[PDB]
Amino acid sequence: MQINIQGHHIDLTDSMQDYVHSKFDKLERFFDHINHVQVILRVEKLRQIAEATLHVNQAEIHAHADDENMYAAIDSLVDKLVRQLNKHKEKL
Ligand SMILES: [Co+3]
Ligand SMILES: [Co+3]
- Find the domain containing 43 and state its range: 1-92
Query: Which ligand gives the minimal distance to the CA of 51?
Result: 1
Q: Using alpha carbons only, give the angle 75, 67, 16 rounded to the nearest 5 degrees.
A: 50
Query: Which ligand gives the minimal distance to the CA of 54?
Result: 2
- CATH number, residue 38: 3.30.160.100
Instruction: Using the mean position of ligand 2's atoms as its centre, give its distance from the Cα of residue 60 in Å.
Output: 6
DSSP output for the chain: -EEEEEEESS---HHHHHHHHHHHHHHTTT---EEEEEEEEEEETTEEEEEEEEEETTEEEEEEEEESSHHHHHHHHHHHHHHHHHHHHHH-
Count Cβ atoms within 10 A of the Cβ of residue 18 and give its class: 0-12 exposed, 13-18 middle, 19 or more buried: exposed
Query: Which ligand gives the minimal distance to the CA of 53?
Result: 1
Number of domains forming the structure of the chain: 1
CA-based nearest residue to 77, from 38, 36, 46: 38
